[PDB]
Ligand binder design. Structure first.
Ligand SMILES: N#C/N=C(\NCc1ccc(S(=O)(=O)c2cccc(OC(F)(F)F)c2)cc1)Nc1ccncc1
Ligand SMILES: N#C/N=C(\NCc1ccc(S(=O)(=O)c2cccc(OC(F)(F)F)c2)cc1)Nc1ccncc1
Lengths: 472, 473
């Protein structure tokens, strides 16, 4: 069973002895710190998961306190654990955390350098608790960053799909999550997959579905979808001389639904030109528009291989020119590039297709490690800092400001998030939100004293995270 | 509760229909595929997966119904192999008819060798081998963390030995700071445990319980820490009271080591004036068992470390060790915990050596660099089918993409062997059977729902030792 007393950085166990004496309040905040491709705005997503799974309800028991005590005695070779402080929460509050958390609504898209949530203790005895839970709350960096990076890729796709086709039809199925095997754990898989689904509807990372169902909720039965597809084992199992037999068997098994077939086991160019393009062409051209063959290269330079596959297919199948002047494969045939795709190569591929006059309608992308694993907390500088304390009954605005790195300076005092007169966002420091010169604080209480006080459905989050181009 | 029918990539739900008719066996293997660095990998983490996810009754009527219901909506179609899963439930009481063979955990093996193999033990379950690819492939993560952590240990060992003449304290020179910087609680535990294969210092408490549950140590815990400040415990005192914060903290932790982050406002002032002058009397009185550890946390990592050491060296009595390198007094050390990864680690220790500072003076903390900034393509961790039996005939299968020879996979039944020179070699096409290379070094670790061979964390650590550690004795 999970024990919140064992879910912090070891050193935090010692901090209750380090704050100034007579400190009744520690108030801290989370931001994606501004830094002097660009990631200028971030999608706030994932806190509700943490609140529900780890923070709410009776999270302290006698047994958990004793367990922590025993572990820390050996871990520190010393007795430093705040057993009294934890027992207080158990006795006074039936083990519920005396903490208030206020947050911007999930799905909200906020520029860098703004407060996204704040945390403070609601009982003076628990001044130490605010930053105890920094570690667990800061892991929100991950769904924020996956959702943000996924959305930035959607912006790239949208721009190029609109340019080459005139519309955004199918945009929400253009970047598929292939990342299940390439992330660090089962738990990460569900979190990351759910964050990508804020922007798209295609996923193979099945763990994302149950997470969304349990913690967020959707009107539709499921938040994400997939279609049948081969992997190398289901092609290569037929033997090297029988690739065509594998292809034939698979497209016939899935004759009436879309099917993707990985075509690079031995020679992608041969497979396209000779196997699909000649030997099995009759099984392709007969397919429904709702059930295309999707040819999947999976190796070589991603741009070069996409362009060469399209060049080959365009000579073996009847290509049209759309109203924008771009080439379009027949509706029973598409391509998916699912190798080496990240935000940078995604851009390179669609720009390269555009240069060669191929519509983005022809292609979808799969992304695995690039989508869910190749991200860190420093990409958006997700960071949690104390900005206000009360000591001897007096509030003081606190902050760090390292001489050699102005980028790490933190905000001062009690914070609030507001709309500016021009409709942008601003974070007011030093309790200036209290002056009421800037309309209502956009932070809402989402957790208080062990209870989740405000929740968002996955549908609401998706609405909040829409692109401007989708809104237009 | 975890449901293995829902723990695969969606497309694998459709694969049972795609294999050749009358296929009775699908046999697959995992390697860290060969491509100048990461030439050898530490095999670690499979035992966790076997125990937590694969062993025992993992199929129930309810889990089958749940998966049926989810996949119906996910695919907008009924493609799920209900019958196949029911067969496992009915015939094997929901235990997986799979056999997995693996190299011992902690073993250090060159790239491009077979690390584990997987095959079905019932012909009806030919589709099961690759169903569990997704979950088994996540072993990439503890393998990669453990390997990258060990590569850092090699750097530290080299420079510690050169500047001090011994390896004392090596296993405490790289501390895990990564708890907040990983992607989940589960990842934190797995990654922290992988780092503990090589070192003993961690703040990622999640790692302790994982090791105790799945591996075990003779000692009460596998890893340790010591008291330390964070910015909030300094800055809460107010900008004009940094000295008061420092004094309070070192007085609270007067007889144990304590680290105090010193860069809240001006690291150089803190070292030269606050520690070096105002509070100097509280430092020089401390025990060798209870040093103050000064922690910079910003700026160029190498430049900041060198400047902090120059400042301290002028305020405190420095000695010259037997190798000719400068050593701070034993009540004073430094920890650099910002911007540390395998690359910057190398730059800092080399820069220190050039300025004649012993590596004894310093320890490193690493967070995202240690536990998060790693992907499956670093060591090209990969699972592939190499052998099938169809119509009663075994055939050796592989991929070999024309545009990427680095993606070629191995053929046939595989085994791992010692060469005459004592190195490793992977034999393909069942050639291990010829018995020209001795016995297969893989061991059956999982069979028909049961874990059949396992390793303690102590054994794993011994297996993962550096050669330099083995040399002496
Ligand atoms: N191809 C593959 N591979 C996988 N999934 C099948 C898969 C995914 C997306 C696409 S698509 O062309 O975007 C598409 C087509 C029609 C409807 C649609 O809509 C929707 F997807 F939502 F159903 C999405 C096709 C087929 N899985 C995979 C996991 C890990 N590693 C490699 C591979
Ligand atoms: N300084 C800090 N910060 C943290 N940990 C305390 C910490 C860690 C290592 C060291 S050391 O100098 O290597 C050391 C000293 C003596 C014995 C020893 O051995 C042993 F490790 F076993 F105690 C290790 C000191 C103090 N936590 C932290 C989490 C996340 N982000 C930033 C910070």
């Amino acid at each position: 069973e999970f024990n919140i007393l064992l879910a912090t950085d070891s050193y935090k166990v010692t901090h209750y002895k380090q704050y100034p004496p007579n400190t009744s309040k520690v108030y801290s905040y989370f931001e994606c710190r501004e830094k002097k491709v660009k990631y200028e705005e971030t999608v706030f997503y994932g806190l509700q998961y943490i609140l529900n799974k780890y923070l709410k309800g009776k999270v302290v028991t006698k047994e958990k306190i004793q367990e922590a005590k025993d572990v820390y005695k050996e871990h520190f070779q010393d007795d430093v654990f705040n057993e009294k402080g934890w027992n207080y929460i158990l006795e006074k509050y039936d083990g519920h955390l005396p903490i208030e958390i206020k947050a911007v609504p999930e799905g909200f898209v906020i520029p860098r350098g703004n407060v996204l949530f704040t945390v403070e203790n609601t009982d003076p005895e628990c001044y130490w608790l605010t930053n105890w839970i920094e570690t667990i709350l800061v892991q929100s960096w991950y769904p924020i960053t996956v959702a943000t990076n996924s959305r930035e890729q959607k912006k790239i796709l949208a721009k190029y799909l609109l340019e080459t086709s005139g519309n955004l039809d199918g945009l929400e199925y253009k970047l598929h999550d292939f990342g299940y095997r390439g992330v660090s754990s089962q738990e990460t898989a569900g979190i990351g997959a759910s964050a990508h689904l804020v922007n798209f509807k295609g996923t193979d990372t099945v763990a994302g579905l149950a997470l969304i169902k349990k913690y967020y909720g959707t009107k539709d039965p499921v938040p994400g979808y997939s279609v049948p597809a081969a992997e190398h084992s289901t092609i290569t199992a037929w033997g090297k001389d029988h690739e065509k037999d594998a292809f034939e068997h698979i497209v016939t098994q899935f004759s009436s639904v879309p099917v993707s077939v990985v075509s690079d086991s031995y020679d992608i160019y041969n497979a396209c030109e000779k196997i699909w393009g000649e030997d099995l062409r009759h099984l392709i051209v007969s397919r429904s528009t709702q059930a295309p063959l999707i040819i999947r290269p999976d190796s070589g330079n991603p741009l070069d291989t996409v362009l060469k596959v399209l060049e080959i297919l365009g000579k073996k199948f009847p290509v049209t020119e759309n109203s924008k002047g771009y080439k379009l494969l027949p509706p029973y045939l598409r391509v998916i590039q699912g190798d080496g795709v990240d935000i940078n190569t995604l851009q390179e591929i669609v720009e390269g297709m555009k240069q060669k006059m191929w519509s983005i309608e022809n292609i979808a992308f799969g992304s695995g490690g690039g989508l869910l694993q190749k991200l860190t907390r420093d990409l958006l500088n997700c960071s949690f800092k104390c900005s206000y304390v009360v000591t001897n009954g007096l509030g003081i605005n606190v902050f760090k400001d390292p001489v050699a790195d102005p980028n790490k300076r933190s905000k001062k005092g009690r914070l609030s998030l507001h709309r500016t007169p021009a409709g942008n966002f601003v974070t007011l420091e030093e309790g200036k939100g209290d002056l009421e010169e800037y309309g209502q604080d956009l932070l809402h209480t989402v957790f208080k004293n062990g209870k989740v006080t405000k929740s968002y459905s996955f549908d609401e989050i998706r609405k909040n995270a829409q692109l401007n181009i989708e809104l237009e």
